[PDB]
Amino acid sequence: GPLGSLRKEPEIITVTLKKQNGMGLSIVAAKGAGQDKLGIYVKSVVKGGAADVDGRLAAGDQLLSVDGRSLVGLSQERAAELMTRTSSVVTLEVAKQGAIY
């Protein structure tokens, strides 16, 4: 769908993968049996990827889009596929609900 929603602190998160291996990030969500668009939200981090390695990623990283591909209602299947061939560089837009001031 359409990208951009709120300002938030993060919004546009980008980090050079190829770090310890991947992004070692555990997402939580899907798409179906609802509005055909489930809100993507990180449940945790593999604690072994640029994500948990960038000391920023963790449970609470709603990705509105990934590599241009909207994630604001994607399925772990597709989302994962997108996050798969991310390359040594991952450029996705994440947002929070409210924390750290």
Side-chain angles (χ1 to χ4, degrees):
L3 65 89
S5 232
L6 301 100
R7 283 240 152 70
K8 304 277 158 225
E9 237 151 346
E11 213 226 37
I12 192 149
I13 289 298
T14 174
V15 298
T16 51
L17 205 234
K18 193 245 167 115
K19 187 129 292 183
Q20 277 184 234
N21 256 8
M23 74 199 76
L25 133 286
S26 287
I27 71 163
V28 113
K31 170 199 125 278
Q35 235 91 24
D36 278 342
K37 54 205 179 84
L38 213 145
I40 286 40
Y41 245 106
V42 176
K43 45 146 140 187
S44 69
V45 265
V46 163
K47 197 164 265 163
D52 224 338
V53 143
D54 185 77
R56 253 200 178 168
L57 256 277
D61 233 79
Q62 184 237 46
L63 317 96
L64 248 130
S65 39
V66 306
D67 276 318
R69 238 275 182 198
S70 223
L71 218 95
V72 71
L74 269 188
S75 188
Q76 67 204 19
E77 201 118 59
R78 186 139 275 197
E81 251 107 41
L82 269 136
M83 257 128 76
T84 291
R85 200 186 239 194
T86 21
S87 220
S88 74
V89 37
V90 221
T91 195
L92 47 292
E93 327 297 293
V94 323
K96 288 177 280 146
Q97 78 210 234
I100 202 76
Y101 198 97

